[PDB]
Amino acid sequence: FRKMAFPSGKVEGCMVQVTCGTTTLNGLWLDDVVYCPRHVICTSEDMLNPNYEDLLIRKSNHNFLVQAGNVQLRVIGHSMQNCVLKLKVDTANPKTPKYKFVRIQPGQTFSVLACYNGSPSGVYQCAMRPNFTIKGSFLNGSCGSVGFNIDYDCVSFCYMHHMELPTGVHAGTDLEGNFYGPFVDRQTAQAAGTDTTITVNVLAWLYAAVINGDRWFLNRFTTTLNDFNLVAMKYNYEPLTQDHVDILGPLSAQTGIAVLDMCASLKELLQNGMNGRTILGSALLEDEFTPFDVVRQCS
Amino acid sequence: FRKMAFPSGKVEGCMVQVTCGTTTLNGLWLDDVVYCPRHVICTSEDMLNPNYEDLLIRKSNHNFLVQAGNVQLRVIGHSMQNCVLKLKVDTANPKTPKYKFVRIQPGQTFSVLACYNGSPSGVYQCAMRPNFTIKGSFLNGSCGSVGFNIDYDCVSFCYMHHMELPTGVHAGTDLEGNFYGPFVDRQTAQAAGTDTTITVNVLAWLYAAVINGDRWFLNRFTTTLNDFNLVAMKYNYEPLTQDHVDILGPLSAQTGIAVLDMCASLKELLQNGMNGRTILGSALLEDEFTPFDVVRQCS
Ligand SMILES: *[C@@H](O)[C@H](C[C@@H]1CCNC1=O)NC(=O)[C@H](CC(C)C)NC(=O)O[C@H]1CC[C@H](c2ccccc2)CC1
Ligand SMILES: *[C@@H](O)[C@H](C[C@@H]1CCNC1=O)NC(=O)[C@H](CC(C)C)NC(=O)O[C@H]1CC[C@H](c2ccccc2)CC1
Numbered sequence: 001f002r003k004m005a006f007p008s009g010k011v012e013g014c015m016v017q018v019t020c021g022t023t024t025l026n027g028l029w030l031d032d033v034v035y036c037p038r039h040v041i042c043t044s045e046d047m048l049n050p051n052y053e054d055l056l057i058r059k060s061n062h063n064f065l066v067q068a069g070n071v072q073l074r075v076i077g078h079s080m081q082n083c084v085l086k087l088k089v090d091t092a093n094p095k096t097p098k099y100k101f102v103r104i105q106p107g108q109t110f111s112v113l114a115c116y117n118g119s120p121s122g123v124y125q126c127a128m129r130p131n132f133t134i135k136g137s138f139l140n141g142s143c144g145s146v147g148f149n150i151d152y153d154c155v156s157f158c159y160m161h162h163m164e165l166p167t168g169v170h171a172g173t174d175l176e177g178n179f180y181g182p183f184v185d186r187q188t189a190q191a192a193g194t195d196t197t198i199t200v201n202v203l204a205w206l207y208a209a210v211i212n213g214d215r216w217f218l219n220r221f222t223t224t225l226n227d228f229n230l231v232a233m234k235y236n237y238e239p240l241t242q243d244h245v246d247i248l249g250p251l252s253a254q255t256g257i258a259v260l261d262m263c264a265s266l267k268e269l270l271q272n273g274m275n276g277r278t279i280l281g282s283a284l285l286e287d288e289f290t291p292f293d294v295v296r297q298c299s
Numbered sequence: 300f301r302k303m304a305f306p307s308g309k310v311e312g313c314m315v316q317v318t319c320g321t322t323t324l325n326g327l328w329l330d331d332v333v334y335c336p337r338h339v340i341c342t343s344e345d346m347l348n349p350n351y352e353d354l355l356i357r358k359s360n361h362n363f364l365v366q367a368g369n370v371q372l373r374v375i376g377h378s379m380q381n382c383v384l385k386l387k388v389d390t391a392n393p394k395t396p397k398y399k400f401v402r403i404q405p406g407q408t409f410s411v412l413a414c415y416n417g418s419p420s421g422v423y424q425c426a427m428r429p430n431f432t433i434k435g436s437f438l439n440g441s442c443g444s445v446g447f448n449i450d451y452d453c454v455s456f457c458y459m460h461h462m463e464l465p466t467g468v469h470a471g472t473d474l475e476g477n478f479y480g481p482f483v484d485r486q487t488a489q490a491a492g493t494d495t496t497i498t499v500n501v502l503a504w505l506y507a508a509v510i511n512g513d514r515w516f517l518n519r520f521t522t523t524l525n526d527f528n529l530v531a532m533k534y535n536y537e538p539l540t541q542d543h544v545d546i547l548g549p550l551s552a553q554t555g556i557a558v559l560d561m562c563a564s565l566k567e568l569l570q571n572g573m574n575g576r577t578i579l580g581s582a583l584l585e586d587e588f589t590p591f592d593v594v595r596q597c598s
Contacts, residue, residue: 002436004421007412009308113306122303122596123422135580137301137596168512213467273575281434283582297421297436 001212001280004297005111006150008123013095017118018144019065026115026144027066027087030096034066034087035175036144037162038080039185047187056080067118082177083162083185097155101175104158106130107198109290110147117141127288130196130238132181133169165192197287199237200244203262204291207251209279211298216277218257221264228263235270247291300511300579303596304410305449307422312394316417317443318364325414325443326365326386329395333365333386334474335443336461337379338484346486355379366417381476382461382484396454400474403457405429406497408589409446416440426587429495429537431480432468464491496586498536499543502561503590506550508578510597515576517556520563527562534569546590
């Protein structure tokens with residue numbers, strides 16, 4: 001059982017390089033539109049407190065250099081939508097997959113195709129935390145890298161990368177340019193607030209553990225939803241709801257472990273730690289697998 | 300800092316479905332040749348102790364159904380090379396990337412594109428352990444999935460998946476069909492022997508930690524190569540050599556921490572555990588990042 005990303009090929013064919021002045025980042029080329037973070041129009045002496053409206057007025061289509069491999073694209077229109085720029089180009093991307101834009105919910109997962117200068121470097125799996133940050137791997141130049149899921153042949157884009165926070169975590173927008181969380185695109189320290197653990201995902205991962213022969217943490221006890229949450233609260237775990245319980249149903253059915261029984265084992269793990277033992281090769285409780293992820297991987 | 304796979308697009312375009320009888324697995328379609336594990340010619344009542352030579356003699360080209368998406372490929376020749384079958388087909392794959400076959404060394408890493416019925420399901424990063432197993436995520440039907448690295452535009456294929464061991468780990472071949480390790484393709488329990496930790500990789504990962512602001516484990520001590528290895532041995536860590544030291548050089552240079560100083564901190568971690576603290580979000584010492592991987596990710 002491994003942290004698995006979706007195959008990235010459909011998205012690799014959408015990444016391009018966007019330069020304005022001396023600032024270069026990545027853009028997403030779908031049909032005849034390139035999407036990129038608006039701070040590509042910023043100089044280093046603009047990022048502290050940019051007035052994007054005023055900065056963009058000084059820019060014309062020909063100030064946007066868009067490059068797909070060795071080929072230049074002609075920019076024939078531009079506009080700002082929230083924190084993203086949309087550059088209309090004269091050529092539809094012939095590699096455009098079936099796609100949609102979605103605004104993902106906290107606790108859900110997606111794959112990130114980290115890019116630099118418009119070239120894919122690597123792919124990994126992330127979760128949108130309850131505080132609307134993600135714990136990625138991003139260097140200077142990675143802005144415009146996107147996060148996505150794939151449903152059959154359809155790519156659902158959900159994230160575009162914009163900035164780093166002092167805690168080392170990452171923040172960004174949906175593909176309409178609205179940040180996840182309370183963040184703004186300026187180079188100041190910003191607070192994400194307390195993060196909380198995604199309880200339903202930890203449970204899913206404990207089920208995956210049991211499915212993979214690791215069972216030492218199961219005990220003889222059960223609990224109540226109300227009583228588990230009294231312990232969840234203390235640990236900054238998200239409260240569990242009956243919808244969570246029914247979401248966990250197929251895993252409970254495959255393992256034969258009632259959900260409230262697994263909750264009892266989780267309380268004991270939370271109160272007593274792991275006494276140096278491990279679970280699927282981790283010494284911490286893992287919360288970036290959804291129930292859906294676990295089902296998909298164990299079938 | 301994250302466990303990152305290479306973009307999988309170049310390899311996605313090489314995966315096909317291979318069926319012989321009622322047994323179906325994945326094959327790798329490069330130029331006019333499809334490569335797949337030879338046990339595709341086995342029935343369930345053959346896998347306990349197959350005589351592959353005898354089994355294959357009963358098979359003709361038309362018994363191999365090769366499917367790429369919705370299109371059948373015509374098989375015009377077949378032969379067995381070690382534990383792989385090579386099916387000559389009448390059509391060169393138009394998506395064949397620049398590629399080579401390499402037999403990878405223990406301690407090195409590569410990406411796995413896990414496939415089922417010839418369709419990519421997910422991508423993740425693995426290491427070839429010192430005992431020539433890998434710790435993957437593979438279900439029935441995943442055989443023929445490949446592992447690879449990418450160097451610029453060139454795909455180096457290094458692994459094809461064949462079987463699972465009782466410990467839950469995985470074993471397979473290079474693309475010439477020679478197993479990594481002492482394994483054979485028959486459905487019996489087989490031993491991998493003691494695994495050992497990849498010391499040079501743990502050091503690389505501690506450097507990555509320091510590069511990412513996590514420094515609590517650094518101490519005031521140093522050691523000697525000879526004296527560190529006395530402690531390595533006891534913990535079933537691989538001995539460190541001066542070549543390892545020079546490999547770690549660029550990381551030592553970027554952080555300003557002498558390699559033997561980092562070795563001192565590692566000895567203390569090994570002797571004293573982590574007392575509930577963490578390093579890059581893990582409560583265990585991580586050994587599936589090479590120095591090269593760390594450099595690539597932190598630049
Ligand atoms: C892409 O342009 C880039 C991605 C960043 C670079 C470093 N890692 C990333 O993920 N984004 C930015 O540079 C971003 C531009 C804004 C939106 C105009 N600026 C940014 O993220 O600035 C951060 C720098 C570090 C700073 C900080 C860190 C630690 C302690 C205190 C303060 C937070 C803001
Ligand atoms: C692909 O065909 C498949 C991949 C396996 C399926 C399950 N997970 C995997 O990675 N390989 C095989 O089925 C393989 C065929 C051989 C090469 C002819 N057989 C195989 O791996 O058999 C294992 C089954 C389980 C068994 C065992 C497990 C636990 C305890 C004792 C014994 C080890 C061999």
